[PDB]
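Exercise 7. Predict the structure of Anticancer peptide CB1a from Hyalophora cecropia.
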Amino acid sequence: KWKVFKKIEKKWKVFKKIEKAGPKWKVFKKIEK
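Solution. The predicted structure, encoded as tokens:
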């Protein structure tokens, strides 16, 4: 069901909202760089 991607779409645009409130989901990747 391609409709499931809609949840993935709002999962990204919504995840970027927390990045400004706490990008702790990307700080762990900073070590890889």
